[PDB]
Nucleic acid binder design. Structure first.
Ligand SMILES: [Mg+2]
Length: 520
DNA sequence: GACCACGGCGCC
DNA sequence: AAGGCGCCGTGGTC
């Protein structure tokens, strides 16, 4: 089938990177397949200019690499997206190939022919799946182009500020470490939970409460240590040591070393086929779990800044999952609460209760994750459902359907297969139930945010603004100072009106020089 | 160098 | 708020 480069327009592309991150990868090889032919590019970088779109497996990644090189090469069809819609457990090329009629190799030509062949089969599987096709055409496929922009754009980071902060935190860690070592009566590796275990529960003879899941060792987690916060001063130091080292090792130290030499910015990856619910994920590095709660966490978030002459615009959906719950269940009362613009919670304290049913929390975990009366905690949970009968009925209906079909679905029909709903082991069955009825909620919220990104992106391009980050129910944009206000106002409207529900969606928006101040 | 499992923990 | 994730250091292996 081998023919000379270039391929005819519309061909399926195959490509090989030196490493998984497209912003950092060397393009080792490039090929394309179509009409019973395969075309291999003599020089991949040059040949990249001959393509009009990236059609094939991992299309977005190639598109990002093209953007890095200053080329406009939007991602198109991608068999990975079709398979992910069919079954969100389809997360890798390896598995999708083996499942739908091929083998994922390390040769571009074969990857091109594979892309073509797999697209043929998958597109066949999606016939009759009207709603899955809608998600593909209206959400996933167009979203892939938005994600490519975000990845290639990156976000600015105050490196010098983080470098200075590292030295400050290092000294405080030293202070905690030396103190812990004194109390232990000896020095040990504080980073080793095994060594720590022995020191706390054997040597210091402190009470061992819970056990680890897989190996049944005596846990040293924060939930456990919290309880011993008064039973020994060493516990206090250990918990402070944990926060500082976690944030230093995970964010403060690594991030500055990841600045791209061409862009001068930090670039993450937004993985589009990585979760069981339809959410995006972020990696290399993960920019969806940057610290925000503690004082030191806030210091770190301040390092994410706007380019000179620009401002960050931060938009957050308010309680989107609860609003989705109101819609899906059709519960009159819950719906009323939002319609009348009242704070559902008043309708961390009583909030744990309201945000509690979204995953069926343990009535016992209410006296712990909220410190209540325990026995009396499992007594108010009935009133919750007494006032929201349609919610219980919805949960019940969801599970019943999940058992019969073998899957649950979001408002738009995104599916997740949950096979353990009839497991004969209680703990397993019940864990499965929690996954099952959470996904229509978390998944619908993901569908909505994705659709909002798809609608918003073209509007931002028109205004010379950029989309930088998504954090599940949040967006961070970057706009020129003279257009920031207009951008903020427009984005809010797009997000709030993405897909009208039985209840309004509300969005909080802020503008600032950095990620933290942009909220306040 | 590389991979993995685990406990642990950061965010939504 | 913390079902859904990704990264850390440790500990073990090849
Ligand atoms: Mg794990």
């Amino acid at each position: 089938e081998e023919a000379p480069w270039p391929p005819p327009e519309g061909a399926f592309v195959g490509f090989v990177l030196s490493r998984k991150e497209p912003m950092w990868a060397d393009l080792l090889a490039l090929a394309a397949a179509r009409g019973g032919r395969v075309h291999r590019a003599p020089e991949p970088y040059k040949a990249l200019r001959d393509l009009k779109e990236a059609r094939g497996l991992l299309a977005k990644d190639l598109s990002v690499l093209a953007l890095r090189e200053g080329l406009g090469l939007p991602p198109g069809d991608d068999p990975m997206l079709l398979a992910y819609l069919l079954d969100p457990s389809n997360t890798t090329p390896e598995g999708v190939a083996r499942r739908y009629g091929g083998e994922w190799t390390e040769e571009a030509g074969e990857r091109a022919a594979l892309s073509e062949r797999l697209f043929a089969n998958l597109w066949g599987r999606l016939e009759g799946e009207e709603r899955l096709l809608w998600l593909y055409r209206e959400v996933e496929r167009p979203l892939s182009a938005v994600l490519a922009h975000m990845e290639a754009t990156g976000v600015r980071l105050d490196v010098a500020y983080l470098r200075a902060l590292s030295l400050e935190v290092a000294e405080e860690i030293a202070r905690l470490e030396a103190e812990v070592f004194r109390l232990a009566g000896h020095p040990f590796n504080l980073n080793s939970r095994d060594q720590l275990e022995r020191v706390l529960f054997d040597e210091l003879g402190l009470p061992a409460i819970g056990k680890t899941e897989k190996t049944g060792k005596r846990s040293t987690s924060a939930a456990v240590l919290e309880a011993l916060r008064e039973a020994h001063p060493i516990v206090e130091k250990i918990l402070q040591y944990r926060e500082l080292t976690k944030l230093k090792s995970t964010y403060i130290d690594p991030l500055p070393d990841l600045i791209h030499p061409r862009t001068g910015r930090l670039h993450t990856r937004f993985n589009q086929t990585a979760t069981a619910t339809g959410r995006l994920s972020s990696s290399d590095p993960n920019l969806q779990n940057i610290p925000v709660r503690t004082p030191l966490g806030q210091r770190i978030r301040r390092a994410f800044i706007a380019e000179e002459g620009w401002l960050l615009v931060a938009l957050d959906y308010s309680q989107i999952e609860l609003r989705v719950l109101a819609h899906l269940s059709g519960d009159e009362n819950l719906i009323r609460v939002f319609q009348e613009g009242r704070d559902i919670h008043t309708e961390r304290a009583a909030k744990t209760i309201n945000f509690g049913v979204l995953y069926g929390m343990s009535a016992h975990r209410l006296s712990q994750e909220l410190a209540i009366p325990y026995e009396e905690a499992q007594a108010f949970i009935e009133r919750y459902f007494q006032s929201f009968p349609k919610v219980r009925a919805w949960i019940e209906k969801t599970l019943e359907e999940g058992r019969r079909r073998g899957y649950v679905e979001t408002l738009f029909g995104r599916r997740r297969y949950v096979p353990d709903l009839e497991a004969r082991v209680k703990s397993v069955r019940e864990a499965a139930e929690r996954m099952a009825f959470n996904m229509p909620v978390q998944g619908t919220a993901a569908d909505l945010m994705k659709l909002a990104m798809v609608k918003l992106f073209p509007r931002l391009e028109e205004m010379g603004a950029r989309m930088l980050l998504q954090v599940h129910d949040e967006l961070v944009l970057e706009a020129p100072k003279e257009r920031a206000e207009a951008v903020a106002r427009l984005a809010k409207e797009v997000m709030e009106g993405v897909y009208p529900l039985a209840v309004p969606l509300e969005v909080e928006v802020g503008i600032g020089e950095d990620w933290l101040s942009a909220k306040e």
